C-alpha cells in the first residue's frame, strides 16, 4: 500500500549509468558504498531502525551485488562487466582457479536474465525483495520487514502481467531465480573467506568489514 515500482526503478537508475579475483574484489568494495545509497532510495528502508538497516544489508549485500553485475552483463559474450569498467572473461576466471563458480553465474543468472529479457524494474524489485529479508537474524521487528517484502512482490506482480500480459508465468519465473541467487551468493562468500584466509588478494576496508563476525 505504498511501494511504487517507479521509485524502485529510480533507485536502480540512480546508482548505475591482472588477477581477475583482485579486480572482482576491488569492484565489490567500490559497489558496497553504492549499495548503501541504493538501499536508502528504496521506499521505507530508511524508516527502519538503523540496527535493522545494518542487519538487512550485512545479510544481503553479496546477493544484491551479484544480481546487479549479472544483469549488467547480459550484453557480454562469455564474461561479466565489473562496475569499474573492467570485463572478466570466462577463460580468465578459469585460468585463475575460479571457473566453477564463474560458470554458475553465467549459466544460472546472466544467461537466464538475458533469455527472458529481465528489465531494470524487475531487477530492482527482485533486489528489493532480497533486501527486505525477514529471515535475517537479529531483526527487532521481522514482521515489519516481511510486510515490506510483500508490498514489493505485490507491485512486481502487478508490473508483470500489465507490461507482459502474454507471459502469465513471468512473475513466478523471476522469483524462481532467487534460490539460484542464494546458492551462488553463499559460494561466493566461501571464496571470499578463503581469499582472506590465504592472505593473497587485497581486500579493501568495506569488503573486509562485511567479512567481519558475525
Amino acid at each position: 500500500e505504498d511501494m511504487p515500482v517507479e521509485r524502485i526503478l529510480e533507485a536502480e537508475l540512480a546508482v548505475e549509468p591482472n588477477d581477475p579475483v583482485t579486480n572482482i574484489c576491488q569492484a565489490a568494495d567500490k559497489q558496497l558504498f553504492t549499495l548503501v545509497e541504493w538501499a536508502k532510495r528504496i521506499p521505507h528502508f530508511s524508516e527502519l531502525p538503523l540496527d535493522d538497516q545494518v542487519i538487512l544489508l550485512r545479510a544481503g549485500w553479496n546477493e544484491l551485488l551479484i544480481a546487479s553485475f549479472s544483469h549488467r552483463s547480459i550484453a557480454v559474450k562469455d564474461g561479466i562487466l565489473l562496475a569499474t569498467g573492467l570485463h572478466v572473461h570466462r577463460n580468465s576466471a578459469h585460468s585463475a582457479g575460479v571457473g566453477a563458480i564463474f560458470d554458475r553465474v553465467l549459466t544460472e543468472l546472466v544467461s537466464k536474465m538475458r533469455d527472458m529479457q529481465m528489465d531494470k524494474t524487475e531487477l530492482g524489485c527482485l533486489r528489493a525483495i532480497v533486501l527486505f529479508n525477514p529471515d535475517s537474524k537479529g531483526l527487532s521487528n521481522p514482521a515489519e520487514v516481511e510486510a515490506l517484502r510483500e508490498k514489493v512482490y505485490a507491485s512486481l506482480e502487478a508490473y508483470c502481467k500489465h507490461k507482459y500480459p502474454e507471459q502469465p508465468g513471468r512473475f513466478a519465473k523471476l522469483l524462481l531465480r532467487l534460490p539460484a541467487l542464494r546458492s551462488i551468493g553463499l559460494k561466493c562468500l566461501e571464496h571470499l573467506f578463503f581469499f582472506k584466509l590465504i592472505g593473497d588478494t587485497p581486500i579493501d576496508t568495506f569488503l573486509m568489514e562485511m567479512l567481519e563476525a558475525p
Partner: peptide, 11 residues
Amino acid sequence: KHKILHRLLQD
C-alpha cells in the same frame, strides 16, 4: 562494530 556501514547509513 561495523563502523563504515553505520556512518554511510547515518549520512
